[PDB]
């Protein structure tokens, strides 16, 4: 259907410990397809998807070049950043970048992203129009000025409208069997006696893809939320996801409680109850 | 396909 390609990049300085840590992992939707990491981590035994492997060694050498090249920029970035914030050389600092493109069902661009954070706080973002920046603070304004003078938004718009889109299509074609699947959640509700008085009902959704899901408990149809204890959607580890929703119910009153799943790979939003098997 | 950053912050 519709898809997103996103890259998540990191540069963490490590004064007195070694050279900065440079990471760059790419996703199509919720599927990691490519990872670059200055910390090597195995003889190029680096989490590549099968449909990237089919791309030549030229693709791989070139992306590696861009990575090494990017680290170089990011070192300059780190240096300038601590100048802007008057921070000593002694501290460790993190630069992060997040970028990529959202395509529609017709493989054309819906939205382009490109934003930065310094020490886990937003720093600068390419606006939706891909022609302007929002600076989070005074320091980022120096970056913004520097970048409007150097026409960076234009360079980024070019990547987002051109290379990003075009390659995302190439990826989606080559990995259709993986990337176009939508695995519905396998669900069930379990009973967990707390006392004679009370019991936890737990509504489970396992094995789903993509990660986007909605797990809600309801009473007779009337919604909870304040009493529903969600857990954070979590990786199964087989490129699939899990989430559960729990609620505490007085004993005897189980049938009054309904679980409502809603997921992309589910033909119609489903209802579940407890059922003593 | 990775993006190129030619201009630092």
């Amino acid at each position: 259907g519709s898809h997103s390609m996103r890259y998540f990049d990191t540069a963490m300085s490590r004064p007195g410990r070694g050279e900065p840590r440079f990471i760059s992992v790419g996703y199509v939707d919720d599927t990691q397809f490519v990872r670059f990491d200055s910390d090597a981590a195995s003889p190029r035994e680096e989490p590549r998807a099968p449909w990237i492997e089919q791309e030549g060694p030229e693709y791989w050498d070139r992306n590696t070049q861009i990575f090494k090249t990017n680290t170089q920029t990011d070192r300059e970035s780190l240096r300038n950043l601590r100048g802007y914030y008057n921070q000593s050389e002694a501290g460790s600092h993190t630069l992060q970048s997040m970028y990529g493109c959202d395509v529609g069902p017709d493989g054309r661009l819906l939205r382009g992203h490109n934003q930065y954070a310094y020490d886990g706080k937003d720093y600068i973002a390419l606006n939706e129009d891909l022609r302007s920046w929002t600076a989070a603070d005074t320091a980022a304004q120096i970056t913004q000025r520097k970048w409007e003078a150097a026409r960076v938004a234009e360079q980024d718009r070019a990547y987002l409208e051109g290379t990003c889109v075009e390659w995302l299509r190439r990826y989606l074609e080559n990995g259709k069997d993986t990337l176009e699947r939508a695995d519905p959640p396998k669900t069930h509700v379990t009973h967990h006696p707390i006392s004679d008085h009370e019991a936890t009902l737990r509504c489970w959704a396992l094995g789903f893809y993509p990660a986007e899901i909605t797990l809600t408990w309801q009473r007779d149809g009337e919604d909870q939320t304040q009493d529903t204890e969600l857990v954070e959607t979590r990786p199964a580890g087989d490129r699939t996801f899990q989430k559960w929703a729990a609620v505490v119910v007085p004993s005897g009153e189980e049938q009054r409680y309904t679980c409502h799943v809603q997921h992309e790979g589910l033909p119609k939003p489903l209802t579940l109850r407890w059922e003593p098997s | 396909f990775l993006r190129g950053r030619a201009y630092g912050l």
Epitope: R62, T73, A150, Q155, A158, E161 | -
Partner: T-cell receptor
Framework: MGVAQSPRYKIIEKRQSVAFWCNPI?????LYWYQQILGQGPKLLIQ????????DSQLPKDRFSAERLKGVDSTLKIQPAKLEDSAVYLC????????????????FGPGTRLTVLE | KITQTQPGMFVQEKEAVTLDCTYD???????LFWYKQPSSGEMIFVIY??????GNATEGRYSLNFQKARKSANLVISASQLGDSAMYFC???????????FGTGTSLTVIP
């Protein structure tokens, strides 16, 4: 402005050395050195992003070298020159090199004509 | 790989010319660039085409007849002047590649 280069012409005896200077369009982060043999198009020697190398796979091993110490001003050097080095040495600058858009386009300098004589 | 064949090329003044150029890429995204080199061999950039831009590239009297399926990017010089000679170079930038690949170049002499 424009991409500036020095000198325009140079005569060298075989085995001697040459330096070529190049000044990119002010603020261009990318800087390329090309060799143009008579009858051919320019063929990339080495490419710089700011002060760092992007690609030098085609820099003739250990006769050719290049610095761009401060990611502005750049210098190409040939130590032992061979006659075969007689060519025009064009440098060029651009904003970017993998944007995949117009900012990739390379603007060349006037070039230096090198003639290596016996 | 750029292939601009024709050893040389002639045209009448005020007439239009097509300088042939067929590339070989396999990449989904790439760019094509035309450059002219007069006597006093300065490399002047003339026209850019991205494999993905919608309408064909136009710049002054220069025009890029870009045909993606046949993989050709002929330069179209219209209303030709005498100052259009000039060797002309066709160059491809492909995402996967590591340089502008320049062709051997076609020289265009403009007959008055």
């Amino acid at each position: 402005m424009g991409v500036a280069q020095s000198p325009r012409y140079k005569i060298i005896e075989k085995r001697q050395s040459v330096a070529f200077w190049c000044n990119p369009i002010s603020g261009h982060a990318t800087l390329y050195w090309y060799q143009q043999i008579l009858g051919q198009g320019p063929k990339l020697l080495i490419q710089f992003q700011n002060n760092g190398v992007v690609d030098d796979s085609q820099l003739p091993k250990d006769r050719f070298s290049a610095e761009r110490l401060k990611g502005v001003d750049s210098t190409l050097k040939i130590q032992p020159a061979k006659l075969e080095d007689s060519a025009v040495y064009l440098c060029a600058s651009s904003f970017t090199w993998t944007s995949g858009g117009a900012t990739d386009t390379q603007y060349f300098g006037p070039g230096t004509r090198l003639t290596v004589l016996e | 790989k750029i292939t601009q064949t024709q050893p040389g090329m002639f045209v009448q003044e005020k007439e239009a010319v097509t300088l042939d150029c067929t590339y070989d890429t396999s990449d989904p995204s790439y760019g094509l660039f035309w450059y002219k080199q007069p006597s006093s061999g300065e490399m002047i950039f003339v026209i850019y085409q991205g494999s993905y831009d919608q309408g064909n590239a136009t710049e002054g009297r220069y025009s890029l007849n870009f045909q993606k399926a046949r993989k050709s990017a002929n330069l179209v010089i219209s209303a030709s002047q005498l100052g259009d000679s000039a060797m002309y170079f066709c160059a491809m930038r492909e995402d996967t590649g590591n340089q502008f690949y320049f062709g051997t170049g076609t020289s265009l002499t403009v007959i008055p």
